[PDB]
Symmetry: C3
Subunit: 444 residues, 3 copies
């Protein structure tokens, strides 16, 4: 299943054996709530609580109408994460909400949901969306609360109205503190049973349905709830769900740590770090590279990522793991003189970069220290090891089952003459450093 | 209204036509909740629920008193975002909460709100703050719950007490998971009707009132709720609201993308990227520049930003868009050899940086691909285009109405000799690169 | 108590007088909720609300069981913050949740909590954890709701069941929008009274107990709630609490701002910035350095940090404050030509970097401007000063009591010849710049 390989030559480790679940597109659906357009002298304590809860309903509608006085929009951005492009996440959902403001477009939705709660509607611009009516407050108020307008009430209707109205109030609270765009999509916007049935009635493959149904918590974190329109007794908000066009392709996570020399005199040390760490997944002949591995969510061996946070690299980028000096791909590195100690916890072990006077160890629960790292970059597997200490920092290692492979090799930092080594190169590569050394050497 | 101009020479696009709403200061207000200092043998099921809800009230007060055992403080920080300064956001509100601990200062507030819920109070240090009493639990408990202390109760008082007490419990929950400082300000801290009336009774211009009232959801996201003091049956917490001293000045958003050469042999390419992307707004003879455009919130054509996240640049910075080689301002760029493909979704179109073997296209809903980008930096408008693909990444473009202008020009990267081009310069400019090239040329 | 020293030579200020509270480890506890495995024809309005609330209970259990279809895991990352290592925060808690899936392990917990709500249990792998039963829904349903299965009910049982079931529903909502791992730990996962007693029954020093009890809001923000297992009528989720192995050691916060020359001709200026800003705390003969001071939480004079976000540096790093040219430690700086104006609000004052044509002032509430900064880097104390203005940005200063010391000195940027000054060095030091200048000088 999950395996790992550490490369002593480049101070890096690769965790193989994962499967992909990349979000490639969006599916926009319209969630609706039918409202009541409702306009005594009694002071009954049972009806006073009804008038109180009914005023919470009037204010919620007014608050949401005041909220839609403008076009919904989220804040847009317009190691190697700074190389990414800039997208507009809710651009697809906003385009669907723009259509619902066209005249007669809401009446098309209101009539389709007249005899059922769930319907597919083709909009005027051509988009085929799935529409869902999740709360019929119009039917409840006009059939139960209106016949009391008095003092013909009971305590059982006060409780039932507070329950039905509570969802509208909570949806309002979320939109009020999020400027009408929320993520992840809470259970008030879409309950678990509603989401599961929404996924089932969705035009996707059987493999996409089973994937989304077995990982609904991830689907929520990758969805947006966009407040849309209140018109003609209909409250509509667009839910924007992820499409996983890439499923079950190989994925692997590259971990990197600084590789420095271990000379005794302080300051005369040179360092080198592979900057291409992150998640990699095979995707359509290329490799989708996610520089900020903190953007992907891992469930057992499934990896959920968003292509918006990816670069599309040639598959030859994998050669940097075996031979960082290969002539087919220019492997990205950074150079530095900052030889500070740290550790990187991998999927099945821990990389340790111990330099200077730092105390680096690997311990077990009952027995204590079992390995003492010397100066340089080293690695230990989580088999038999429970914690790793670098300086004053205690790292817990991941206790997942898997086999690691230690690939011995000469650290490539030893191949560089420190006198002509180009320190302080942040976005560099093997060929750039060689081109810079060749200039410094010719100038001597 | 909204227009856009793409500059082929520098691979950048400017979106003009926006209006400003910059937060320049803070207005601190004091929100109060009057508490009851309350100290049978019956087992009535109606009174047992009252004793349960009353114990939730006692614990909430104790939890908030335990919360104020120290001075409230938020975590402080002390492309071009690293050039920003460091502020203390709640420093103004904390100074107001420090005054409320002075003796007799709380009694001044308690007496001002005796005959009304809303009052302006001048504190001892000279600050004139607006005080609001939003919940009188003291009056409810002492007039309704105290007369039952028994078993003279009904179910209608159990429900009404749970409703009034629920707000205090929720305010407590928020402060417990936020260390007494919350943002945005939820509807439990300040309801929509309370906030709107607070804005109305605020000493500001009529233009500031209408702006804040039409964008209350933004005012929440730019406000802080600071837990303050519990003393003498009074629960006080400071709400810190934004002041928009700059309103309706021109704003524009600068989008930049890497500009590289398109030579066939891999690695021999040089790249150049304008680093001055972000939001720009005219402000008091200068230009307020926001390097991280993700910090500003856009509502239709209004742009809400915080001057704390801005630099104050000369208005001559606008010359970099027309002539990046102008002698009046040193335009900021970065150099690199990393020619990776990406796209930047603009307000009215999309910039495409296609390099190497990447497949870059622009498509429509029904018809599919309509443009195939060649190697280099190019642009397409959202008119007729719905999606843009770079590699394995699908970008949805913004469907907002507006007119774009394509300004043809020679890409400035072609003006540089690659042999003496200074690659890997992150925080550089046009003059710095020229000064570095002149040194490499003189040394040959 | 709190003091501050500004160094005019290096444009930096140190705030001394704080005490440490560094998280060094984790303590995992198991929170349990006993569930009821429950399987009429009446339409009574009192029993219909019971069947409604009972179906919310069935769905909550089903939703949580569907949530555990995989191993819980959070998104992992694998000025000087980029030098930090990479940990797995919930690795310790996940290893405890992995043990609860072993057969018979849950039955050990179920029997220990049979006669009490609070117990210490030694697991099969050897870990001694504290187990807590916080909700016995099994006892409530089987003793009160089961005897009605009808129409023997009252309204007092509908309210009491909605109250007890509400906590399970809220715990479910949090786990649904967080993929089973939440932080901070809300009051639904662990109430304030439960947490305080959990801290009391914890195997730690008396000093750790009093510290955690007086700062429970911080303990929440540094804890994780990990959804674990639902097996044999037991709902278990692991709460992972911080261990503060370092307490009451000296801490100080280093603030830095750009130091530039003030020549009249634009562009001919060189800049220099100390990059070692952040929090420093004495820790076990070394110094724990936190490069991103926004990760530490300050309560009065106590500083709560996490060693996972720290580097372990020699105590000689403190010499950079008095003598940045000391031969014992290579002080980290960055070089630049970007002379932009900004301010840094310190604990007791404000650093001002005024360059070019920027208007930099320091004002008071009633009197207005009292100091006008000239070009260069300067400092003002919060005594008598309420606000600081740099350009169009208004900074409020911290009004905390304390004494500042202005240490006069020649700005070290004046010691460098601009013709051979190495601009655009991001991760550099004093010795690196000298080594680069010596090369440029020998080449002339
Ligand atoms: C200089 O370039 C040549 C050819 O590209 C290469 O073989 C040699 O190793 C380079 N020199 C250094 C010091 O990297
Ligand atoms: C060198 O500097 C001069 C004057 O500043 C300028 O005209 C020339 O273009 C520079 N050379 C290069 C290669 O940029
Ligand atoms: C060159 O190095 C020597 C010895 O390390 C030092 O004394 C001198 O100041 C350096 N020169 C410059 C310009 O920094």
């Amino acid at each position: 299943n999950i395996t790992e390989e550490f490369y002593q030559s480049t101070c890096s480790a690769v965790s193989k054996g994962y499967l992909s679940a990349l979000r490639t597109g969006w599916y926009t659906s319209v969630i609706t709530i039918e409202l009541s357009n409702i306009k005594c002298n009694g002071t009954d304590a049972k009806v006073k609580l009804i008038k109180q809860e009914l005023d919470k309903y009037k204010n919620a509608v007014t608050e949401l109408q005041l909220l839609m006085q403008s076009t919904p929009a989220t804040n847009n951005r317009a190691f190697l994460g700074f190389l990414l492009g800039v997208g507009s996440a809710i651009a697809s959902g906003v385009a669907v909400c723009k259509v619902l403001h066209l005249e007669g477009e809401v009446n098309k939705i209101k009539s389709a949901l007249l005899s059922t709660n769930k319907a597919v509607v083709s909009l005027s611009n051509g988009v085929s969306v799935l529409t869902f009516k999740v709360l019929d407050l119009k039917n409840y108020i006009d059939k139960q609360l209106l016949p009391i307008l008095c003092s013909i009430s009971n305590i059982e209707t006060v409780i039932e109205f507070q329950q039905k109205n509570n969802r509208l109030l909570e949806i309002t609270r979320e939109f009020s503190v999020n400027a009408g765009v929320t993520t992840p999509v809470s259970t008030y916007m879409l309950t678990n049973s509603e989401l599961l049935s929404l996924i089932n009635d969705m035009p996707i493959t059987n493999d996409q349905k089973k994937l989304m149904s077995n990982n609904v918590q991830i689907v929520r974190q990758q969805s947006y709830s966009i407040m849309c329109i209140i018109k003609e007794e209909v409250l509509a908000y667009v839910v924007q769900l992820p499409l996983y066009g890439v499923i079950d392709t190989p994925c692997w996570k590259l971990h990197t740590s600084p590789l420095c020399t271990t000379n005794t005199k302080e300051g005369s040390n040179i360092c080198l770090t592979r900057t291409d760490r992150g998640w990699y997944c095979d995707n359509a002949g290329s490799v989708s590279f996610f520089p900020q591995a903190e953007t992907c969510k891992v469930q057992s061996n499934r990896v959920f990522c968003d292509t918006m946070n990816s670069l599309t690299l040639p598959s030859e980028v994998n050669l940097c793991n075996v031979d960082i000096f290969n002539p087919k791909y220019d492997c990205k590195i950074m150079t530095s003189k900052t030889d500070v100690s740290s550790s990187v916890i991998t999927s099945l072990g821990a990389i340790v970069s111990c330099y200077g006077k730092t105390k680096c160890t690997a311990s077990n629960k009952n027995r204590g220290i079992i390995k003492t790292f010397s100066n340089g970059c080293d690695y230990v597997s989580n088999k038999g090891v429970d914690t790793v200490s670098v300086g004053n920092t205690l790292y817990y290692v991941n206790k997942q089952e898997g086999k690691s492979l230690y690939v011995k090799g000469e650290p490539i930092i030893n191949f560089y003459d420190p006198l002509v080594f180009p320190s302080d190169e942040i976005d560099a590569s093997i060929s750039q450093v060689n081109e810079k050394i060749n200039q410094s050497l010719a100038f001597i």
